[PDB]
Structure formats: structure tokens, C-alpha cells
UniProtKB/Swiss-Prot annotation, chain A:
Full protein stretch here: 101 to 149 of 397
Cysteine-cysteine disulfides: none
Transmembrane regions listed in the UniProt entry: none
Chain's role: AcrA-AcrB-AcrZ-TolC is a drug efflux protein complex with broad substrate specificity that uses the proton motive force to export substrates. This subunit may act as an adapter protein that links AcrB and TolC stably together.
Subunit text: Monomeric in solution. Homotrimeric; interacts independently with AcrB and TolC as well as AcrZ. Part of the AcrA-AcrB-TolC efflux pump.
Record organism: Escherichia coli O157:H7
Coiled coil: 1-49
Protein name stated in the entry: Multidrug efflux pump subunit AcrA
Superkingdom assignment: Bacteria
Compartments (UniProt record): Cell inner membrane
Family named by the database record: Belongs to the membrane fusion protein (MFP) (TC 8.A.1) family.
Swiss-Prot record, chain B:
UniProt function note: Outer membrane channel, which is required for the function of several efflux systems such as AcrAB-TolC, AcrEF-TolC, EmrAB-TolC and MacAB-TolC. These systems are involved in export of antibiotics and other toxic compounds from the cell. TolC is also involved in import of colicin E1 into the cells.
Impact upon substituting D30A: Decreases inhibition by hexaamminecobalt(3+)
Full-protein positions shown: 367 to 415 of 493
Protein known as: Outer membrane protein TolC
Reported consequences of knocking out the gene: Cannot grow on efflux substrates novobiocin or fusidic acid.
Compartment(s): Cell outer membrane
Family per record: Belongs to the outer membrane factor (OMF) (TC 1.B.17) family.
Subunit structure as annotated in this protein's UniProt entry: Homotrimer. Part of tripartite efflux systems, which are composed of an inner membrane transporter, a periplasmic membrane fusion protein, and an outer membrane component, TolC. The complexes form a large protein conduit and can translocate molecules across both the inner and outer membranes. TolC interacts with the membrane fusion proteins AcrA, EmrA and MacA.
Top-level division of the source organism's lineage: Bacteria
Organism name: Escherichia coli (strain K12)
Record's comment describing the protein's domains: Forms a continuous, solvent-accessible conduit: a 'channel-tunnel' over 140 Angstroms long that spans both the outer membrane and periplasmic space. The periplasmic or proximal end of the tunnel is sealed by sets of coiled helices.
Amino acid sequence: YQATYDSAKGDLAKAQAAANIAQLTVNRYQKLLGTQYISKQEYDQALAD
Amino acid sequence: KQAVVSAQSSLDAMEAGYSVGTRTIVDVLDATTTLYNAKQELANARYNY
């Protein structure tokens, strides 16, 4: 239970990592919408992430 | 005049396309170069006027 316990902590850190990546793609695909920079398409790709 | 304006906002749209990387720095120097060309077309054509 210690091994599955800290293993669950490690995969928790993995979900924090991928969620951090997806969150930063949301922000820096979010601050430039409606322009030539980023459209709604890859924005909603980042929201699916 | 329309070539200077459209080359200016098109230059800035090449700054957009290079900021996203869809076009290289070559097109930046082409809209830049062609922009200065249209500058000498308009100003030098004021001289020819």
C-alpha cells in the first residue's frame, strides 16, 4: 500500500504536469484570439487538452 | 499609396506569419524589401511627378 500510495502520488504529479501543459496552451492560445495570431480552432484544441 | 499601405499591413501580417512561423524570415525581408521598394516608387514617383 505504500508502493501504490506513493505511486498514486507520482501519477498525481503526472496529471499535474500534463494539466499544467494544457493550461499554458489555454492561456497562450487564449490571450490572442480573434486575430491573425490564434483562431478558435487550436484554441478549442487547447480547451480539449 | 495603396501598395505602401497594403505592403505595410501585409508586412505586419508577415510579422504575424513569422511570429507563428508559417512564413520564414525570407518573406519578412520580401514584404520589407518590397515595402521600401514601394516607398521609392511613391516618393521617387513624386520626383518623377
